[PDB]
Structure 1
Amino acid sequence: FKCVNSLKEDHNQPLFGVQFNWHSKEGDPLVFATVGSNRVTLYECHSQGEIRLLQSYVDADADENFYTCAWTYDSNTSHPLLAVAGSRGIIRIINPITMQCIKHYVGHGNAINELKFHPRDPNLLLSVSKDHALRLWNIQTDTLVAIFGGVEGHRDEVLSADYDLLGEKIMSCGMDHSLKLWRINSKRMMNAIKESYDYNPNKTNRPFISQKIHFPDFSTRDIHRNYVDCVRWLGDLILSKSCENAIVCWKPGKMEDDIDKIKPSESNVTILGRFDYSQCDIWYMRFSMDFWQKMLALGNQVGKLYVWDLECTTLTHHKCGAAIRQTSFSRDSSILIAVCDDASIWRWDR
């Protein structure tokens, strides 16, 4: 990788999220979204390190602080869609062509920390909140499918979540130091997803009833000793981090335990390895994998970017000294974008 370009957004506020649109065809524009303050900004990556500003979305609320974004597509037209959320705890669906808000979702009792779209179903949106819960929405029928939380749910703010390869299960993590598994391929969840597609408030005066999922399918507090702020699946394995200068690779149960044979009472975990680094001991620092899950990247609090080959290189620039909150690889992994606390954007080309 080589740093080919850098820019700074006019608002001067930290950038907390960045996502390349992985739903674009080869030979079509390489587009990424950034989120900071009450702004959502789209950019195009061109040859010779060129970054072109496409459009900006400024939220009506000046007090809104976007923390996360996620791309999807309209299942009927294949047109891209962008979901954004933050401090207001409102999910906003943006048309990226016009950069206008199509619709919004209200429900969480507090800020939304992360948004994730189901890897098979482009209409299933997962939100994680400061209210200790996770919510699964069907954005085609504007329905709340399920709420993951309560008695055995997270006991503090949820910071991150990730669907596995097929979207059969979710792993969530947060301020209570725990990592919790939620199976969504259960007869109950599959039926709830099916029913959410049959719902239309214009053909019934009755509200759609959300599944109240009080119990996870696995839980551990034995990986990290502080806020778990990022979780990703690596096949049947888990990559997770706290502010303890390490990304831990682990799995539920004993070494040979199949993840789909794990019972909710499972008291064991197996640590398979760690990715060690420095000066990334502050809260709210995201690691990211490329589409192929062959590359791993994490920015640190003083502008250094760590990249590991999953099959360590430290990317540095003398002008990049602010905390790197999130990174995003282009679909082909040829480009790596880093976003910072000083509203700066950094482009690294392979």
Structure 2
Amino acid sequence: YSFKCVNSLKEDHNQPLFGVQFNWHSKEGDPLVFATVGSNRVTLYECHSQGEIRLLQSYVDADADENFYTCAWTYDSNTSHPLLAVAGSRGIIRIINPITMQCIKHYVGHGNAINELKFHPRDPNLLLSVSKDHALRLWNIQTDTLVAIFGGVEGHRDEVLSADYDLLGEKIMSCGMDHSLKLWRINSKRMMNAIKESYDYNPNKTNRPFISQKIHFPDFSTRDIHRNYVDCVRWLGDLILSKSCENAIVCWKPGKMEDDIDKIKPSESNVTILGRFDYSQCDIWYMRFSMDFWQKMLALGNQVGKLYVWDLEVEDPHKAKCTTLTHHKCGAAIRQTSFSRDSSILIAVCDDASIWRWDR
């Protein structure tokens, strides 16, 4: 839509900014706030009138060689205060108090790089991490427990790059460098019981370690959508949007056209393609698209600084309406975009450590 570019800035490290996220848990009446991640830091900024991007404070890791790749917001389920999780090459998930930028606590399992964090859409304590070690991990950050590891030889066979929960957090689609997209249901009796037990675990009141589920079989798998690394995935209701580095976002579903997603069996060998949104000059990998809170729109930047925005408020996915946003000084690769919760601001972040603000 009618976005215009109102400001830009550049962070002093001059390294790629791999991630950006608005805080969609920001309180009514408070300014909109987004986090960026790159180098060994996470930084918060607040959006103000006349395009102003006000710098607040950063968390910088003790290790000069950490490189954060991803971040995700949630809130504390007892106090409501927002929390920010960040992770990257060291394989350590940090939970940061965004007010003071203190690291409240940290988790290690992957010890191996973490490429995407996502919080469950209904339970602010359930955090999913995906790793260079080929596994996804589900953590409960209220009881500090590893609920489950999704892996095995029928899991991913190379780095996992992205994943996403469906609308109700019943199932996850993951994707990665093995070219595949895998479905993992977490509303099975086994996983619902595992989540319930994680909430019952308090290591001060018992002698047992908490046992993690090892989930070694996905509920569906395909390598038939893309022919290279699959680096971003999002559910759109029961359909999937996914991309690789082949200048396309494919909209598809498991099974045949009339197959209900909850009747798909793990042996399902067909997929249905509902449409494909092509674009240009985005053939490097780790380039992530984002949607607004309502899933009316989708944004992706490319490797020369162009933004594509598709309006998905149309009757079928292939009728999406595309708008492009360019600025003569924005020429570096855009790695991720984020919309504000009210959809009035889109930020893009770049490989040259620049930040670009477009206002509706």
Same fold (TM > 0.5)? yes
CA offsets per residue over residues 290-317 of structure 1, 9 Å max, x none? Answer: 0000011000000011011118111111
1:293 aligns with one of 292, 295, 300: 295
Decide which moves more: 130-139 or 54-63.
Answer: 54-63
CA offsets per residue over residues 160-214 of structure 1, 9 Å max, x none? Answer: 0000000000000000000000000000000000000011111122200000000
Compute the displacement of 1:84 (Å).
Answer: 0.2
Counterpart secondary structure, 1:147: strand
Counterpart secondary structure, 1:195: helix
Counterpart in 2 of 1:248? Answer: 250
Counterpart secondary structure, 2:262: coil
Decide which moves more: 243-252 or 46-55.
Answer: 46-55
Mapped partners of 1:124, 1:73: distance in 2: 11
Mapped partners of 2:294, 2:350: distance in 1: 25
Counterpart secondary structure, 1:317: coil
Compute the displacement of 1:25 (Å).
Answer: 3.2
Mapped partners of 2:206, 2:106: distance in 1: 21
CA offsets per residue over residues 92-128 of structure 1, 9 Å max, x none? Answer: 0000000010000011041000000000000000000
Compute the displacement of 1:151 (Å).
Answer: 1.9
CA offsets per residue over residues 318-346 of structure 1, 9 Å max, x none? Answer: 11100000000000111000000000000
Mapped partners of 1:336, 1:27: distance in 2: 19
CA offsets per residue over residues 131-177 of structure 1, 9 Å max, x none? Answer: 00000000000000000001210010000000000000000000000
Contact 2:231 / 2:285 at 8 angstroms: preserved in 1?
yes
CA offsets per residue over residues 254-292 of structure 1, 9 Å max, x none? Answer: 000000010000000000001110000101100111000
Counterpart in 2 of 1:163? Answer: 165
Contact 2:287 / 2:302 at 8 angstroms: preserved in 1?
yes
Compute the displacement of 1:15 (Å).
Answer: 0.1
Contact 2:155 / 2:217 at 8 angstroms: preserved in 1?
yes
Query: TM-score, normalized by length of structure 2?
Result: 0.96
CA offsets per residue over residues 42-81 of structure 1, 9 Å max, x none? Answer: 0000111111011111111110000000000001111000
Contact 2:90 / 2:111 at 8 angstroms: preserved in 1?
no
Query: TM-score, normalized by length of structure 1?
Result: 0.99
Mapped partners of 1:151, 1:243: distance in 2: 25
Compute the displacement of 1:26 (Å).
Answer: 3.3
Q: Unaligned regions of 5+ residues in structure 1, if any?
A: none
Counterpart in 2 of 1:268? Answer: 270
Contact 2:305 / 2:330 at 8 angstroms: preserved in 1?
yes
Task: Kindly indicate whether residue 351 of structure 2 is the aligned counterpart of residue 341 of structure 1.
Answer: yes
Mapped partners of 2:26, 2:286: distance in 1: 29
2:35 aligns with one of 24, 29, 33: 33
Compute the displacement of 1:250 (Å).
Answer: 0.2
Mapped partners of 1:281, 1:333: distance in 2: 28
Q: Unaligned regions of 5+ residues in structure 2, if any?
A: 313-320
Compute the displacement of 1:27 (Å).
Answer: 2.1
Mapped partners of 1:78, 1:288: distance in 2: 25
Mapped partners of 1:28, 1:186: distance in 2: 39
CA offsets per residue over residues 222-267 of structure 1, 9 Å max, x none? Answer: 0000000000000000000000000000000000000001000000
Mapped partners of 2:266, 2:240: distance in 1: 17
* Percent identical: 100
Mapped partners of 1:56, 1:26: distance in 2: 23
Compute the displacement of 1:216 (Å).
Answer: 0.3
Mapped partners of 1:332, 1:295: distance in 2: 12
Mapped partners of 1:298, 1:26: distance in 2: 28
Which contiguous aligned blocks of 4+ residues in structure 1 show a shift greater than 2 angstroms? none
Compute the displacement of 1:29 (Å).
Answer: 1.6
Where does 1:130-279 land on structure 2 (aligned, <5 Å)?
Answer: 130-279=132-281
Counterpart secondary structure, 2:303: coil
Mapped partners of 2:285, 2:121: distance in 1: 27
Mapped partners of 2:242, 2:353: distance in 1: 26
1:329 aligns with one of 332, 339, 356: 339
Counterpart secondary structure, 2:28: coil
Where does 1:14-53 land on structure 2 (aligned, <5 Å)?
Answer: 14-53=16-55
Aligned residues: 350
Contact 2:92 / 2:111 at 8 angstroms: preserved in 1?
no
